[PDB]
Amino acid sequence: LTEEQIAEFKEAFSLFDKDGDGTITTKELGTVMRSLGQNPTEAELQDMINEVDADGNGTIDFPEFLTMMARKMKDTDSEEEIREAFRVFDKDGNGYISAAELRHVMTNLGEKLTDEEVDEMIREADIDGDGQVNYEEFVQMMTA
């Protein structure tokens, strides 16, 4: 496990933990999912938490969140989820995620990123070096 990977997990948890109280509730999960264009029901949100709710307190803490993330990346099924996730970023549908498209989504998640921070995220996922993220590059980013 890398110090850099821990830092990313922390930032990812922060995007869900809207009020910063260290736990992610069904309401916070639903808010994130709707900002990504999804519409889960109250029962679907409870199911999502219950899958990883090791202490049964109805909310997600940090190690439970890591468990949730690792299961999603190490899935091998639900590639339609990955295609759906790609479409969330690729809003003009042209097959490439631009820095501007990424900035737009991060803004909808409530993030404040500098121009360099957005370019660094594109750089890290870019494989062929064209300065955008195509679908194959995205698949690799979302996969273990």
Ligand X SMILES: COC(=O)[C@@H](N)CSC/C=C(\C)CC/C=C(\C)CCC=C(C)C
Residue ranges of the annotated binding site are 17, 19, 21, 23, 28, 53, 55, 57, 59, 64, 90, 92, 94, 96, 101, 126, 128, 130, 132, 137
Q: Is 12 in the site for ligand X (CB under 6 A)?
A: yes
List the x/- string, 50-89, binding to ligand X by CB under 6 A. ---------------------------------------x
Minimum CB distance to ligand X, residue 43 (Å): 25
Encode burial over 12-51: b for 16+ CB neighbours within 10 A, e otherwise: ebeebbbeeeebbbbebbbebbeeeeeeeeeeebeebbee
C-beta closer to Ca ion: residue 76 or 142: 142
Minimum CB distance to ligand X, residue 113 (Å): 6
Q: In the bound complex, which residue of the shown chain has the CB atom lying closest to ligand X?
A: 11
Residue ranges for the known binding site for Ca(2+) are 17, 19, 21, 23, 28, 53, 55, 57, 59, 64, 90, 92, 94, 96, 101, 126, 128, 130, 132, 137
Encode burial over 79-102: b for 16+ CB neighbours within 10 A, e otherwise: eeebeebbeebbeeeeebbbbebb
Nearest C-alpha neighbor of 60 from the set 18, 22, 34: 22
| Neighbouring-strand partners of residue 110 | none
Other CB atoms closer than 10 Å to residue 11's CB: what's the count? 10
Question: By CB under 5 A, what part of segment 40-69 binds Ca ion?
Answer: 53, 55, 57
Q: Given the structure tokens 């989504």, which residue do they identify? A: 105
C-beta closer to Ca ion: residue 21 or 42: 21
Q: Are 103 and 118 in contact (CB under 8 A)?
A: yes
